């Protein structure tokens, strides 16, 4: 009985009794994954070296690996006939599909998350949240401007040892492996539950300086209990999609908390932090600013940025009360 | 012209007036490195899912990614027919090569190293150091106790958002990304040296309690720069190769020193430190225990471990100082 996405969401589809526009964009959101792996994974890189002649063009100008998967997603999409409006990390404004390719869905995504790994092969990955046609007015950058709770699926793709694709819908969160052998993701977690209590910490210490007092308490907790329990350990990639999927599968808590430089934190509420967040709460987890849910926050930019603190639903609940002690 | 690492190795063999079992051992190590990274990368898994039933197995036996990697690392390197001593993280006592296929190198490696990772799908990777047996005994475990300065060649693979191999050899470092559609690992940088200052530090903060003065001097120092620069960035993967990778390639410091239950360090010497010591400073850096260089312990025991700092000649010297000053 093995289950690849495409039966799961063909499937899901029909028990939801959907006319089949939903089920198409996640199967083209699952082609523009595979397509984004594939060159991720850098293959084709000798022609680029010139294997077949024509090596003098090295200055580089030809599709940087960012705005390639941001061609192929926005592609894809469009080609779904599912989607009116796109939201993308890498354009200034909310993309307006074409009234010929036009559907109910509004997709906010980062199409290759953890740019500052790129370079050194770290892993990277790609981040979506799919929302309904709320209005039924004019499609606009404002249909994008939902809080999270309105979310219809959201997940992530991880470009990792192994490609991975983890989908958050209503009923829950289902991980599926990439064989890229044959193209096909497999299922091979099913409505995934983070535990309760972790023993792992995520965060970018370097920016202790710059910390508010109940994330210096939190982080001092850590390393020296009072209880004089086990230190947690310490994890921090470097990019979101990857500490973030740790954090769903080990447990622990991942923090991106405001601090006095970046006074409204440093992710994108509406394609990084509102997917996640999505993902841990359909899992049994925490999504929190530290003084509120972040899919109960109202967007008012489509490139506004967020704190954010996320995981275990027990070390989450215990650095929000050390928030609440601080006043 | 393009360069394959087969045509390197093979080159650089020639110029070397090498008899040619040095080049074989070498061109070995890369189909063995081929062969992980396509397992690491889940190719075939659909199999392991059943999707053409349950036939193809006639009993339960199936080997985790890491028995798998050691028996492809001990294969392929034996069939070269160019080694006499083996030294794996997963075997208790070195592997003496059978007298039919021995040849004079001695291999000490980490077939898959970042088992901690593996789970999550963080970056892992392969690491090897390689000995010219010095002795007309016997072959035996002692001909693996060399200090690191007796390497003839040394590196690493980096199975993360793509794959690649890092060769270290008496003129340098040169760095091999792999195309996984022909099989060719492709000269991407020539002679790599890293920078001299690097601003970026990787350590487990969660040991904090365990530290000696001056790690925790120093890690305050780039938390709150006396000089009042812009602090370092913190990154830490998890997985050695992933994280000493970063290093090279950007610069800055990666440190394993001793703790609690490691007070001698966690990282083994032989097939963990020496190998990233070696890169480290054919590449210009440093590599350290903190009280000297980590290439000129004389080991005693094949799995001893050792406490290592590294990375970027004038972050190291800084803690180096520090060190120091305290004595
Ligand atoms: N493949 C699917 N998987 C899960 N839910 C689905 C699927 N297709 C449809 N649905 C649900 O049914 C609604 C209407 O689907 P549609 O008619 O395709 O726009 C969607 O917004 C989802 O809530
Ligand atoms: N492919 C090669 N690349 C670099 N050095 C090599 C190579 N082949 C041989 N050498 C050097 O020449 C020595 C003798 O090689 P061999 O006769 O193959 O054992 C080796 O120990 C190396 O120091
Ligand atoms: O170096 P910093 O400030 O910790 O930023 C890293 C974060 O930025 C991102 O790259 C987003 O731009 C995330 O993937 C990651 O969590
Ligand atoms: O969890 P810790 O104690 O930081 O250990 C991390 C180290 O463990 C290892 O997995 C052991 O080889 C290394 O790859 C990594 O650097
Ligand atoms: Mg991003
Ligand atoms: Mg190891
Ligand atoms: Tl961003
Ligand atoms: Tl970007
Ligand atoms: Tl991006
Ligand atoms: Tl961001
Ligand atoms: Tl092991
Ligand atoms: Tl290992
Ligand atoms: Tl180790
Ligand atoms: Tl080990």
């Given at each position: 009985?093995?289950?690849?996405?495409?039966?799961?969401?063909?499937?899901?589809?029909?028990?939801?009794?959907?006319?089949?526009?939903?089920?198409?964009?996640?199967?083209?959101?699952?082609?523009?994954?595979?397509?984004?792996?594939?060159?991720?994974?850098?293959?084709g890189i000798a022609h680029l070296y010139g294997i077949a002649?024509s090596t003098?063009?090295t200055?580089?100008?030809?599709?940087?690996?960012?705005?390639?998967?941001?061609?192929?997603?926005?592609?894809?999409?469009?080609?779904?006939?599912?989607?009116?409006?796109?939201?993308?990390?890498?354009?200034?404004?909310?993309?307006?599909?074409?009234?010929?390719?036009?559907?109910?869905?509004?997709?906010?995504?980062?199409?290759?998350?953890?740019?500052?790994?790129?370079?050194?092969?770290?892993?990277?990955?790609?981040?979506?949240?799919?929302?309904?046609?709320?209005?039924?007015?004019?499609?606009?950058?404002?249909?994008?401007?939902?809080?999270?709770?309105?979310?219809?699926?959201?997940?992530?793709?991880?470009?990792?040892?192994?490609?991975?694709?983890?989908?958050?819908?209503?009923?829950?969160?289902?991980?599926?492996?990439?064989?890229?052998?044959?193209?096909?993701?497999?299922?091979?977690?099913?409505?995934?539950?983070?535990?309760?209590?972790?023993?792992?910490?995520?965060?970018?210490?370097?920016?202790?300086?710059?910390?508010?007092?109940?994330?210096?308490?939190?982080?001092?907790?850590?390393?020296?209990?009072?209880?004089?329990?086990?230190?947690?350990?310490?994890?921090?990639?470097?990019?979101?999609?990857?500490?973030?999927?740790?954090?769903?599968?080990?447990?622990?808590?991942?923090?991106?908390?405001?601090?006095?430089?970046?006074?409204?934190?440093?992710?994108?509420?509406?394609?990084?932090?509102?997917?996640?967040?999505?993902?841990?709460?359909?899992?049994?987890?925490?999504?929190?600013?530290?003084?509120?849910?972040?899919?109960?926050?109202?967007?008012?930019?489509?490139?506004?940025?967020?704190?954010?603190?996320?995981?275990?639903?027990?070390?989450?609940?215990?650095?929000?009360?050390?928030?609440?002690?601080?006043?």
């Amino acid at each position: 009985n093995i289950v690849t996405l495409t039966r799961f969401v063909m499937e899901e589809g029909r028990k939801a009794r959907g006319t089949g526009e939903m089920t198409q964009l996640l199967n083209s959101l699952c082609t523009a994954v595979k397509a984004i792996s594939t060159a991720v994974r850098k293959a084709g890189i000798a022609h680029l070296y010139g294997i077949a002649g024509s090596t003098n063009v090295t200055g580089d100008q030809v599709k940087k690996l960012d705005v390639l998967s941001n061609d192929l997603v926005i592609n894809v999409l469009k080609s779904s006939f599912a989607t009116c409006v796109l939201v993308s990390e890498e354009d200034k404004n909310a993309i307006i599909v074409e009234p010929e390719k036009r559907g109910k869905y509004v997709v906010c995504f980062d199409p290759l998350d953890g740019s500052s790994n790129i370079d050194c092969l770290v892993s990277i990955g790609t981040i979506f949240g799919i929302y309904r046609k709320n209005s039924t007015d004019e499609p606009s950058e404002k249909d994008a401007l939902q809080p999270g709770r309105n979310l219809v699926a959201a997940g992530y793709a991880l470009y990792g040892s192994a490609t991975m694709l983890v989908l958050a819908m209503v009923n829950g969160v289902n991980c599926f492996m990439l064989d890229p052998a044959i193209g096909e993701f497999i299922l091979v977690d099913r409505d995934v539950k983070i535990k309760k209590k972790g023993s792992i910490y995520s965060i970018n210490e370097g920016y202790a300086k710059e910390f508010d007092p109940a994330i210096t308490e939190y982080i001092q907790r850590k390393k020296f209990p009072p209880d004089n329990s086990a230190p947690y350990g310490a994890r921090y990639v470097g990019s979101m999609v990857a500490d973030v999927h740790r954090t769903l599968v080990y447990g622990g808590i991942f923090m991106y908390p405001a601090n006095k430089k970046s006074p409204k934190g440093k992710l994108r509420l509406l394609y990084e932090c509102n997917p996640m967040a999505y993902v841990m709460e359909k899992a049994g987890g925490l999504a929190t600013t530290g003084k509120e849910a972040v899919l109960d926050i109202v967007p008012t930019d489509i490139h506004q940025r967020a704190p954010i603190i996320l995981g275990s639903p027990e070390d989450v609940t215990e650095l929000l009360e050390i928030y609440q002690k601080h006043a």
